[PDB]
Write an enzyme that holds these catalytic residues in place. Structure first.
Site, PDB file in Angstrom:
ATOM      1  N   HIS A  61       8.552  -0.834  -0.665  1.00 42.99           N
ATOM      2  CA  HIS A  61       8.279   0.563  -0.984  1.00 42.99           C
ATOM      3  C   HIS A  61       7.151   1.133  -0.125  1.00 42.99           C
ATOM      4  O   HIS A  61       6.903   2.333  -0.128  1.00 42.99           O
ATOM      5  CB  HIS A  61       7.980   0.734  -2.482  1.00 42.99           C
ATOM      6  CG  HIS A  61       6.717   0.077  -2.940  1.00 42.99           C
ATOM      7  ND1 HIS A  61       5.469   0.559  -2.616  1.00 42.99           N
ATOM      8  CD2 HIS A  61       6.509  -1.006  -3.727  1.00 42.99           C
ATOM      9  CE1 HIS A  61       4.546  -0.195  -3.185  1.00 42.99           C
ATOM     10  NE2 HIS A  61       5.152  -1.153  -3.864  1.00 42.99           N
ATOM     11  N   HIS A  91      -2.730   0.985   1.662  1.00 42.23           N
ATOM     12  CA  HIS A  91      -1.368   1.319   2.038  1.00 42.23           C
ATOM     13  C   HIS A  91      -1.297   2.825   2.219  1.00 42.23           C
ATOM     14  O   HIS A  91      -2.255   3.535   1.927  1.00 42.23           O
ATOM     15  CB  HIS A  91      -0.376   0.888   0.949  1.00 42.23           C
ATOM     16  CG  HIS A  91      -0.670   1.474  -0.397  1.00 42.23           C
ATOM     17  ND1 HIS A  91      -1.485   0.854  -1.318  1.00 42.23           N
ATOM     18  CD2 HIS A  91      -0.291   2.645  -0.960  1.00 42.23           C
ATOM     19  CE1 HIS A  91      -1.597   1.616  -2.391  1.00 42.23           C
ATOM     20  NE2 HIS A  91      -0.882   2.708  -2.198  1.00 42.23           N
ATOM     21  N   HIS A  93       1.396   6.535   2.176  1.00 40.07           N
ATOM     22  CA  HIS A  93       2.558   7.226   1.638  1.00 40.07           C
ATOM     23  C   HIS A  93       2.812   8.253   2.734  1.00 40.07           C
ATOM     24  O   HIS A  93       1.875   8.901   3.206  1.00 40.07           O
ATOM     25  CB  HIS A  93       2.225   7.937   0.329  1.00 40.07           C
ATOM     26  CG  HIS A  93       1.894   7.003  -0.788  1.00 40.07           C
ATOM     27  ND1 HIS A  93       2.857   6.429  -1.588  1.00 40.07           N
ATOM     28  CD2 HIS A  93       0.710   6.491  -1.196  1.00 40.07           C
ATOM     29  CE1 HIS A  93       2.280   5.603  -2.441  1.00 40.07           C
ATOM     30  NE2 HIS A  93       0.978   5.621  -2.222  1.00 40.07           N
ATOM     31  N   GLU A 103       0.530  12.464  -1.478  1.00 43.10           N
ATOM     32  CA  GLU A 103       0.830  12.516  -2.898  1.00 43.10           C
ATOM     33  C   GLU A 103       0.000  13.633  -3.510  1.00 43.10           C
ATOM     34  O   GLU A 103       0.539  14.527  -4.167  1.00 43.10           O
ATOM     35  CB  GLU A 103       0.535  11.162  -3.538  1.00 43.10           C
ATOM     36  CG  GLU A 103       1.402  10.066  -2.923  1.00 43.10           C
ATOM     37  CD  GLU A 103       1.559   8.858  -3.812  1.00 43.10           C
ATOM     38  OE1 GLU A 103       0.541   8.220  -4.145  1.00 43.10           O
ATOM     39  OE2 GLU A 103       2.712   8.553  -4.181  1.00 43.10           O
ATOM     40  N   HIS A 116      -4.367   5.089   0.878  1.00 43.04           N
ATOM     41  CA  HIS A 116      -4.996   4.642  -0.354  1.00 43.04           C
ATOM     42  C   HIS A 116      -5.641   3.272  -0.216  1.00 43.04           C
ATOM     43  O   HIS A 116      -4.958   2.278   0.032  1.00 43.04           O
ATOM     44  CB  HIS A 116      -3.963   4.592  -1.490  1.00 43.04           C
ATOM     45  CG  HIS A 116      -3.453   5.939  -1.901  1.00 43.04           C
ATOM     46  ND1 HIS A 116      -2.334   6.103  -2.685  1.00 43.04           N
ATOM     47  CD2 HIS A 116      -3.915   7.184  -1.644  1.00 43.04           C
ATOM     48  CE1 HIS A 116      -2.124   7.389  -2.891  1.00 43.04           C
ATOM     49  NE2 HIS A 116      -3.070   8.068  -2.271  1.00 43.04           N
ATOM     50  N   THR A 195       0.107   5.435  -8.419  1.00 37.35           N
ATOM     51  CA  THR A 195       1.220   6.356  -8.242  1.00 37.35           C
ATOM     52  C   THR A 195       2.596   5.709  -8.159  1.00 37.35           C
ATOM     53  O   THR A 195       3.586   6.381  -7.873  1.00 37.35           O
ATOM     54  CB  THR A 195       1.006   7.232  -7.009  1.00 37.35           C
ATOM     55  OG1 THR A 195       0.862   6.399  -5.853  1.00 37.35           O
ATOM     56  CG2 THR A 195      -0.254   8.090  -7.186  1.00 37.35           C
ATOM     57  N   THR A 196       2.651   4.406  -8.396  1.00 40.51           N
ATOM     58  CA  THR A 196       3.916   3.690  -8.383  1.00 40.51           C
ATOM     59  C   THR A 196       3.928   2.813  -9.619  1.00 40.51           C
ATOM     60  O   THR A 196       2.870   2.474 -10.156  1.00 40.51           O
ATOM     61  CB  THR A 196       4.063   2.778  -7.135  1.00 40.51           C
ATOM     62  OG1 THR A 196       2.975   1.848  -7.094  1.00 40.51           O
ATOM     63  CG2 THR A 196       4.073   3.606  -5.862  1.00 40.51           C
TER      64      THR A 196
HETATM   65 HG   LIG Z   1       8.921  -2.201  -4.014  1.00 43.22          HG
HETATM   66 ZN   LIG Z   2      -0.683   4.642  -3.017  1.00 42.22          ZN
END
Ligand SMILES: [Hg+2]
Ligand SMILES: [Zn+2]
Ligand SMILES: N[C@@H](Cc1c[nH]c[nH+]1)C(=O)O
Ligand SMILES: [Hg+2]
Length: 257
Positions: A61, A91, A93, A103, A116, A195-196
């Site tokens: 992801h 990581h 986004h 985000e 992040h 956020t995930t």
């Molecule tokens: Hg994943």
């Molecule tokens: Zn993040």
């Protein structure tokens, strides 16, 4: 499994993770005219001089750069935080186009990507216990805008080809995260969540006002990654961001006036 597609996207997460409709969910839109300056907020203290990066991994992801957190090598303190927080991984986004990808948004404005840097409160012993506390995590958010290339980011950009598909990892030592910081450390802060999934509400968010610039070429390489595993139909890793959530009963504070 949860994802960012039409049948497993953010709008479907609540079915498996009820907290998705919780009271302190992230990200949120930062309304600059409603954020309140807070004179009691201390300056942010980022000590990344002894950081020890270990590996880079495509988890299906996004991609994480993991650090050794068995000691206080890279810590974040000050600001709205109480105690010391250890960096565990960072990581990004990003979007399929330069007009979307972050985000958090500022006055509804979307950036090309959002970085992040995740830290956990040392008083809880380990990350696992930290995500069972309202003040267990602290995430530093940095916006990326398309413009001039960011030298310090190229090292990450060049290794992406080796972790194209889900599950792949590669040694990634001696990377200095200080090369990804903007010049100013002014910020906004509010209580939120990851956020995930599992979308745990243990995060004190610190979103920097100043974004860093990255070249079109650098962002393009992020978009060549795959959500899929090796030997499966190719699905480009793009638009792995969650839409803004309702602020509800929360106040966003600013460290600058
Ligand atoms: Hg994943
Ligand atoms: Zn993040
Ligand atoms: N999804 C896992 C692992 C992870 C860390 N960062 C992103 N994903 C949690 O929980
Ligand atoms: Hg929590």
């Amino acid at each position: 499994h949860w994802g960012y597609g039409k049948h497993n996207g953010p709008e479907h997460w609540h079915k498996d993770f009820p907290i998705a409709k919780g009271e302190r969910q992230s990200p949120v839109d930062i309304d600059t005219h409603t954020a309140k300056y807070d004179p009691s907020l201390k300056p942010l203290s980022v000590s990344y001089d002894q950081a020890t990066s270990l590996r880079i991994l495509n988890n299906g992801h996004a991609f994480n750069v993991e650090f050794d957190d068995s000691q206080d090598k890279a810590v974040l303190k000050g600001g709205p935080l109480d105690g010391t927080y250890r960096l565990i991984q960072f990581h990004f986004h990003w979007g399929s186009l330069d007009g979307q990808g972050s985000e958090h948004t500022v006055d509804k404005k979307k950036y090309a990507a959002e970085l992040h840097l995740v830290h956990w409160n040392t008083k809880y012993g380990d990350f696992g216990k930290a995500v069972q506390q309202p003040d267990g995590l602290a995430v530093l958010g940095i916006f990326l805008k398309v413009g001039s290339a960011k030298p310090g980011l190229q090292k990450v950009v060049d290794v992406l080809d080796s972790i194209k598909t889900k599950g792949k990892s590669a040694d990634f030592t001696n990377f200095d995260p200080r090369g990804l910081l903007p010049e100013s450390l002014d910020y906004w802060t509010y209580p939120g969540s990851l956020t995930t999934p599992p979308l745990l509400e243990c995060v004190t968010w610190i979103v920097l006002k100043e974004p860093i610039s990255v070249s079109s070429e650098q962002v393009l390489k992020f978009r060549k990654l795959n959500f899929n595993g090796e030997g499966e139909p190719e699905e480009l890793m793009v638009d792995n961001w969650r839409p803004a959530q309702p602020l509800k009963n929360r106040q966003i504070k600013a460290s600058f006036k």
